[PDB]
Design a protein around this nucleic acid. Structure first.
Ligand SMILES: Nc1ncnc2c1ncn2[C@@H]1O[C@H](COP(=O)(O)OP(=O)(O)O)[C@@H](O)[C@H]1O
Ligand SMILES: Nc1ncnc2c1ncn2[C@@H]1O[C@H](COP(=O)(O)OP(=O)(O)O)[C@@H](O)[C@H]1O
Ligand SMILES: Nc1ncnc2c1ncn2[C@@H]1O[C@H](COP(=O)(O)OP(=O)(O)O)[C@@H](O)[C@H]1O
Ligand code: BEF
Ligand code: BEF
Ligand code: BEF
Ligand SMILES: [Mg+2]
Ligand SMILES: [Mg+2]
Ligand SMILES: [Mg+2]
Ligand SMILES: [Zn+2]
Ligand SMILES: [Zn+2]
Ligand SMILES: [Zn+2]
Ligand SMILES: [Zn+2]
Lengths: 334, 333, 362, 365, 364
DNA sequence: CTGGCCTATA
DNA sequence: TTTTTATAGGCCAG
């Protein structure tokens, strides 16, 4: 968990209200992944839990700050998911909501950091509702998501929103060039793949990840011309599939943009592979395929337990069918 | 080590008892019957004290120190039984056994129950130096092939006279549930003291009750026998199999078919089976399938499997069982 | 002793409640006529006064002054409820205590008479969360409680309750609060707090409330933080992501001219400007609507549009009714399906692209 | 006080409908053929919990096992006030466990303190664990002379076939619009409460077959309308508008005339009528109409004031067409959440009608 | 009650089930008594009834016989309820181990009136893991004077390790005629007026169970005031109809819009969940489209519904079936938006009717 | 009253 | 060679 420089102003604005004591007790921060929401919060958390605060700052030498520094501080609750899992269950919320009625074990303020509100189960989000509307005193909540609209109706209305907008592209590319050494085109693409957020960008270069995009592109550069798309299985069938499916999605879209002669593309760095999609695929099928590729991505992330190999395999065989002349193509519903 | 079929056992327990009786198998009936055939002939040889002991990896190193001690002379002859874990003899219990291999009396008779072993499990020292001393019985159930013989055999041991056609109609109803087939005869000899089991006679005294595994079903789809399939589903339901398990096993094979049917235009059939490590006995079956099914049927197969998986885990639907009844017929054209 | 407005300004006498005048009427009417039921169920979308009203009905039942419809707020009993300390208003977090084993405790302690109040009033809130088994346990008690017991149930979402539970309650469905209803209220509150504000900014906030007073009070509180003390038109409109009128239409236009390169390139300057995407989609739905309308009678275009009005009519005269319906339809579906696509941007791009390739018929 | 509860029938005379159940019980009591396990099933509010008690009351009346209990002898009044030592009303939904069913059983042997029969009436019986249904099995097949079981539930299917086979199943039917109205009237009269005749038709209808649902609805009609059950009050409360303005728009729409559609909506809009609400009364009218085509007698009893005009519409418009309008008004609903402004959404959905109108499409350029 | 009165006390008296009785009979006769019997099959087919006969024939004063006398002290003693050495355990309410351990502490003492201590354990599937283990220890080494009769609807639940120690007899569902015959017998003896077809309607409705049958009759007799008429039984079975969704499909294909909208009304009485009717319909259409691809696609399951189904399958067009199916599925997708879920199903069938291929809807 | 175990619903 | 997950209700041995 690292601290990025574009947080300063967003932090100085948010503390302020707290520094006056008129801070809202339930902040929902909406930020892309890697935008550094967790650090912005940690900073707000540490400031609330410090007994001898030097202005905005947490001191380091008070009992409160010591405990915080060493993981255990009785009044800081982390609501993330069980190690093996990817949802955030109700029972976990209930511990936290009960313990909250005990006078602060260290006679201070209590903070609850819900790491990703999106992961709250249906039952979990509701259990969180009544406490969240009117918690005990000197209780402070922090929730974070990508997309507040995916979040329970009624929970969203108990919170104050704060938007963590990402820095201008230009700043972000200049930021990046100093952390990785890659082509200018590369950065720009990573950055654009990642909806604007540096560091989520930067994340791509650090992993096995960027090597895997190149592999998706290698394969794609074969499937297109030849019409063998079942051949993508290999590059897509990984646990990171939702992510790579998104790569695939953005390529398809760039191709569609070129069929309309658009200026920006997302995959700036492979303008070769983009042009070759615009060449061997009609707009009609470019678009239909963009359709199913996102749609499966949702189901792969949303349906608990669903089998990837089977679902990706259906998609690939089904795409090949669309490729045929005269087949009936899909059209969004309702 | 004299290996045996449970039928042959009664005879080689008469000749001579041997220090170590090994009952490995999966079938509940052939286990019990063999088990008891020994216990019975051991009483009759002076044996009063019968001790049983189920072995989990749970049995401490204090539980196995009360077994090695469980044999000292001179006590009226005692019959020590041991039951086994899913896995068979782990590295923890591969050694405990070694302790018991050398304390063997005419006074202490060992009986051991469990599944078939892995090949380096059987070849683990203790078991081979048990070898010339021990009898070992195969209790694997007979399959749709080997079965009628086993019936027309037991039929005769009970001196009843079965018909080519009655033998068929028993093997249909009780496939994989030998214990029920066994009582099927017991029940028919009480019905008719003639001992003659004409077809129409046997028809009236039967009820349908086969046990299959999901495998039997994919096998049946693979070979295109559909009336078989359908039976196999409806039995697999009334046993309460998690339909998810059906899905995932029909898929290991249905996706494998997809992938072979493609490469089958480029490289020969025989090379592909090898490339993929296709168990030898499965290999004939597969080809049959690859031949009858189009590269498009296979695709609709895959799509349809998917719709039922989403319908199961997303929509919480009931359809699941009858969506497979349909998927089952599609793979049989 | 600070608290968010959303919390501070909870109506503490019937008088202080905005709208829902049909529920307030029936309630006060029965409290007076003597027609008091044993199980009221209150429903409606988030933050429209469901549980604020439960809490008020309770005051009206227990008030040291009499069973009233206009409770005072000045007895041990009304203050005590205002603060949650009141002992004969058992308030239950249904969404949290969902288990039967728990609501069976609830029931075992119903028979017992009230402490210092006149009625034991159970307030089960978020009630649609109780296990299936829990609902059914209430069945017999809800239908035939002790004379000293009242059950006040509230939930966003009554769909979910067994039809047997509904059968047994009076159901008051609270309407969503009218745009003006919300604004007047925002006005009143910002005045009492002594906080500066600009008329038209309250206008954006009532819209943005999307029918809900809490939603709205929570937005306002957000205004006061980002705005540095004031709720200005300037501030709100930057925080909400509101649109300067041109950019919206420009897109509508380029969209129906099948002009791909420009629609795309227009969205891109819009992504720079940091426009809220659901808001673009919505203004576009609004324009498509005007247009379709004016094709009906020339008169339906507003006084309000003067600046656009020249470009509007043309779109009306050129583009066939049929083809505008498909445009609107397509962008409607896109707004629905927006929050599912991998970026918000990417979803407007997929949506526009789709509608783009409509232009020619045959 | 509360109607729903006050008017629980106290004799078989007072029960609405359920002839096929009453006639059987009655024929059986005087015929002396009395089962030991009666099971009662049907939707919420149709009189199972109260028929069960009436049965009990008649089984135990000091005058003799009779189908007309006397409602006066200690035993009768005491069952009416629910404090009869020998009517054991078991809330199945709280005694769900086995260890609870087991206590009930243990005390079956012991005889009755005051009555002819110990009557266990297990209400909401579908809630009992699998474990405690089976507990019930042999005792429910072969009880002691002096025991009877009255089981009642909303859905029977949840019960093991082993139970079902063991008892008489009386399935109560839901009540007809007429039957509900007639009651709602009788009561409101008896309880001296002014009412407009239509407000009752309106109520009986929204009851969706359930006599409680009805009484619960009246209870709050009385409150909404202030001691009066008036038409304005009921339709207010029910989301219904009074019925002309809904139809008028349909008509105007089939007749392709735009001005009037749009005007009729502007007028809907000064009244602040609720938008989803409207689109519904219309699918509602469009249905009854397509309905009337099919079977003529089908048209309701509640739309007398409108029948002249409705009947007309069915005669003059092709069924293919009507399914079209419904269709369009339906997706129109499906869409409404997402459309920019609930009004605009309705307006826009009617414009889709017009643009795709069968007989007079809107003018192409 | 008829269910109770007419429980057979003699082997002669038992309906069908002949492949069990004959094997019992003969085994008694020829000295082959297993230490333990298990009786299975469905509700109300004679499981426990035969268990009790076996106990009589096993202990009769005349001696071990297939033709117990029903008259000697021991035989009326059992008929009655109180026979010292017939220990009938209601296993569903005595399932814990504590109780099974005690039941069996007395297994070892010799019997105090007859040849045999007979433990009759009924609804035996309910016993815990632990009570099974204990039961099993006593069937692995059965005393000589003891016999065990185990009865249950669901045998699939006893350990493999117990079924392996019980001769298990599976009782068959009784047949329409078999049940109709016994209906006639009984009604006659009680002296009660009945029409022929009224009975054939009862037996059909019983769904293979002689209890569901006598239970249906007692109720019949009531509705008809002491007479079992077709005018009355017909009525009361319409009260009790599972039926409406198969019936709507028959009615829909045949174009019968009165019968179609009447059945929808019969469904409102029963108090149906509407999305539920739709989905049962879709599900039949499916099931049928498959008995088009093979005969074997109809259930061991289906039986009562079955006859109608194969006929539905024959006399329909398979291109048509996917037509009705499309319309039904869509009506479902539409149903939560239709104004009244009733209206929704109504308008969905009405749509099925206007676009009926075979006999379409009259236009002005 | 716990920890092992089965089940039902979404 | 044999499998979705979150929440709930429940039975039992000791
Ligand atoms: N009708 C109303 N009048 C005044 N304030 C309201 C109204 N509805 C909601 N509010 C505001 O919303 C806050 C929460 O209201 P609440 O009654 O809890 O809504 P809910 O129905 O969703 O529980 C209140 O504190 C009050 O500020
Ligand atoms: N057949 C009926 N006759 C008269 N009132 C009825 C009838 N059915 C239901 N009610 C009304 O509903 C109230 C509760 O009915 P109840 O018998 O509990 O229905 P349930 O079958 O769902 O338990 C009664 O007090 C009565 O006013
Ligand atoms: N084969 C049969 N012959 C005569 N009556 C039967 C038969 N089967 C069931 N019955 C009737 O059903 C009643 C209960 O039968 P029972 O044998 O207890 O069924 P179960 O198999 O479910 O224990 C008996 O009293 C008898 O009237
Ligand atoms: F936020 Be409310 F209780 F719907
Ligand atoms: F209100 Be009833 F018993 F469903
Ligand atoms: F007595 Be049975 F098993 F219904
Ligand atoms: Mg609330
Ligand atoms: Mg009731
Ligand atoms: Mg029985
Ligand atoms: Zn500090
Ligand atoms: Zn007061
Ligand atoms: Zn009386
Ligand atoms: Zn005798």
């Amino acid at each position: 968990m690292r601290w990025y420089p574009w947080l300063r102003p967003d932090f100085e604005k948010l503390v302020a209200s707290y520094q006056a004591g008129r801070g809202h007790h339930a902040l929902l921060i909406q930020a892309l992944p890697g935008m550094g929401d967790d650090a912005l919060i940690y900073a707000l958390s540490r400031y609330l839990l410090c007994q001898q605060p030097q202005g905005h700052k947490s001191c380091g030498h008070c009992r409160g700050c010591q405990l915080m520094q060493a993981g255990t501080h009785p009044d800081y609750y982390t609501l993330a998911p069980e190690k093996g899992k990817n949802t955030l269950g109700v029972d976990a919320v209930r511990e936290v909501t009960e313990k909250l009625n005990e006078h602060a074990r260290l006679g201070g303020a209590k903070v609850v950091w819900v790491t990703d509100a999106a992961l709250l189960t249906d039952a979990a989000a509701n259990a969180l509702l009544k406490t969240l509307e009117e918690p005990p005193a000197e209780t402070w909540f922090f929730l974070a998501t990508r997309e507040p609209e995916r979040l329970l109706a009624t929970l969203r209305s108990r919170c104050r929103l704060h938007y963590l907008a990402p820095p201008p592209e230009q700043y972000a590319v200049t930021w990046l060039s100093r952390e990785v050494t890659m082509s200018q085109d590369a950065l720009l693409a990573a950055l654009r793949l990642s909806a604007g957020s540096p560091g989520a960008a930067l994340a791509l270069f650090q992993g096995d990840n960027w090597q895997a995009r190149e592999t998706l592109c290698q394969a794609l550069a074969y499937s297109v011309p030849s019409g063998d798309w079942y051949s993508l299985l290999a590059a897509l069938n990984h646990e990171q599939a939702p992510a790579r499916l998104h790569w695939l999605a953005t390529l398809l879209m760039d191709a569609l943009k070129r069929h309309h002669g658009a200026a920006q593309v997302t995959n700036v760095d492979v303008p070769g592979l983009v042009a070759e999609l615009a060449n061997h695929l009609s707009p009609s099928r470019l678009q239909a395929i963009l359709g199913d590729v996102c749609h499966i991505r949702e189901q792969l992330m949303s349906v608990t337990g669903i089998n990837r190999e089977l679902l990706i395999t259906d998609l690939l065989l089904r795409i090949e069918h669309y490729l045929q002349p005269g087949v009936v193509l899909p059209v969004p519903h309702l | 080590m004299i290996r045996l079929y449970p039928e042959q056992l009664r005879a080689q327990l008469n000749e001579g008892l041997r220090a170590a009786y090994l009952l490995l198998g999966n079938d509940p009936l052939l286990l019990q019957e063999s088990q008891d055939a020994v216990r019975q002939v051991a009483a009759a040889q002076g044996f009063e004290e019968h001790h049983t002991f189920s072995i989990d990896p749970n049995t401490d190193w204090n539980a196995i120190f009360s077994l090695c001690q469980a044999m000292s002379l001179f006590a009226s002859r005692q019959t020590l039984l041991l039951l086994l874990p899913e896995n068979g003899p782990n590295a923890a219990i591969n050694e405990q056994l070694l302790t018991l291999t050398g304390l063997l009396h005419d006074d202490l008779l060992l009986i051991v129950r469990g599944n078939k072993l892995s090949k380096a499990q059987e070849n683990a020292a203790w078991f081979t130096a048990l070898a010339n001393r021990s009898v070992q019985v195969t209790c694997q159930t007979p399959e749709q092939a080997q079965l009628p013989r086993w019936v027309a055999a037991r039929a005769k041991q009970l001196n009843l006279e079965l018909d080519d056609a009655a033998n068929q109609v028993l093997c249909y109803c009780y496939e994989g549930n030998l214990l029920a087939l066994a009582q099927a005869l017991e029940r028919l000899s009480l019905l008719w003291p003639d001992g003659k089991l004409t077809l129409p006679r046997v028809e009236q005294a039967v009820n349908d009750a086969a046990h299959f595994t999901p495998f039997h079903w994919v096998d049946a789809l693979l070979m295109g026998k559909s009336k078989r399939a359908l039976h196999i589903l409806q039995q697999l339901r009334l046993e309460g199999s998690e339909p998810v398990i059906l899905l995932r096993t029909l898929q290991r094979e249905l996706l494998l078919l997809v992938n072979l049917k493609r490469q089958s235009a480029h490289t020969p059939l025989r090379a592909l089976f090898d490339k993929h490590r296709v168990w030898q006995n499965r290999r004939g079956m597969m080809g049959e399938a690859l031949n009858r099914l189009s590269q498009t049927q296979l695709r609709q197969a895959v799509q349809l499997l998917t719709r039922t998986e989403l319908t199961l885990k997303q929509d919480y639907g009931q359809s699941v069982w009858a969506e497979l009844e349909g998927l089952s017929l599609l793979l049989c054209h | 002793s600070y608290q968010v407005l959303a919390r501070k300004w909870r109506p503490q006498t019937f008088a202080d409640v905005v709208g829902q005048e049909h529920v307030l009427t029936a309630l006060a009417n029965g409290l007076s006529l003597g027609r008091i039921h044993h199980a009221y169920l209150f429903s409606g979308t988030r933050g429209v006064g469901k549980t604020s009203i439960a809490r008020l009905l309770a005051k009206g039942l227990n008030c040291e002054t009499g069973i009233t419809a206009t409770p005072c707020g000045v007895c041990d009993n009304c203050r005590e409820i205002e603060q949650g300390r009141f002992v004969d208003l058992i308030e239950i977090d249904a969404a949290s205590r969902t288990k039967v084993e728990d609501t069976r405790d609830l029931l075992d302690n119903v028979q017992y008479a009230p402490a210092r109040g006149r009625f034991k009033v159970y307030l089960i809130d978020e009630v649609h969360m109780l296990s299936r088994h829990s609902f059914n346990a209430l069945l017999k008690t809800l239908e035939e409680p002790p004379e000293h017991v009242k059950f006040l149930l509230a939930t966003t979402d009554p769909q979910k309750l067994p039809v047997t539970i509904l059968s047994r309650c009076l159901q008051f469905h609270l309407k969503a609060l009218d745009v003006e209803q919300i604004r007047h209220q925002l006005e009143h509150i910002l005045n009492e707090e002594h906080i500066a504000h600009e008329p038209r900014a309250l206008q954006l906030l009532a819209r943005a409330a999307e029918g809900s007073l809490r939603d709205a009070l929570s937005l306002t509180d957000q205004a006061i933080a980002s705005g540095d003390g004031q709720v200005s038109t300037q501030a709100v409109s930057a925080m909400l992501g509101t649109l300067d009128d041109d950019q919206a239409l420009s897109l509508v236009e380029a969209m129906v001219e099948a002009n791909g390169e420009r629609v795309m390139a227009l969205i891109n300057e819009a992504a720079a400007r940091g426009i809220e995407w659901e808001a673009l989609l919505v203004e576009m739905l609004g324009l498509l609507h005007r247009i379709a309308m004016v094709q009906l009678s020339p008169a339906a275009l507003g006084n309000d549009m003067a600046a656009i009005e020249l470009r509007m009519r043309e779109l009306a005269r050129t583009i066939p009714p049929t083809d505008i319906q498909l445009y609107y339809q397509t962008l409607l579906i896109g707004r629905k399906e927006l929050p599912y696509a991998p970026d918000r941007r990417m979803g407007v791009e997929m949506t526009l692209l789709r509608a783009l390739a409509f232009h020619p018929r045959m």
